[PDB]
Amino acid sequence: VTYFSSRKGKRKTVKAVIYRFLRLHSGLWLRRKAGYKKKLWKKTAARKRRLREFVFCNKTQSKLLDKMTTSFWKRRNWYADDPYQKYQDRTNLKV
Template structure:
């Protein structure tokens, strides 16, 4: 197993040897473009005319180390029945609606409230929907128990559990309008 420090050192040595990103032109901050004169920074022009550098993927050391880094795709199974276990952080951070959608709170809603505008503070208090890919992933990360509808007394999410306006999820029969 390789540590991240070894990976960083290897990448740094590779970049230093190829002199790709350690060129002095990259370290110069480009000057702001003036609206009256329209002068452009010389650093930007020098970077524009540079030759393309070789890809890091051509270096065998970096490819070998990046393939050996552990990823966090861990699936835990129960000992007794061999079922997949639910991920506890999903149950804490997300809430599943009866029609299969997941909602979550906005990240950073308690941080730096003093610097947020009034409209931003109101928007941060609201919940947002996860997209279809995220909902599928979250369904895989929880067990069948958590995918079944749960009914609570005075549920604050009760109006959101039904989705009558959508063709594939409505439950109530549509009103019949005869054609004339």
């Protein structure tokens, strides 16, 4: 992470985080499961199903991924047809 850039003096973003993850507006980060394209003929139907699925990251991670991302990716987004738009709000959460 670059905390102050050379030319603009701003705070840079790590792009390798932007390619594998997704930030919902609740703050949950959403990631693929490692090795899902890898050696399928070995694995059971069960394991294949477990691998195709998307999953959520623990607090320690979401926190870390947040530090590597600027304000622009924490933004509220309305896309036409957005699949995940139905998932971006949190409901019935009594902490």
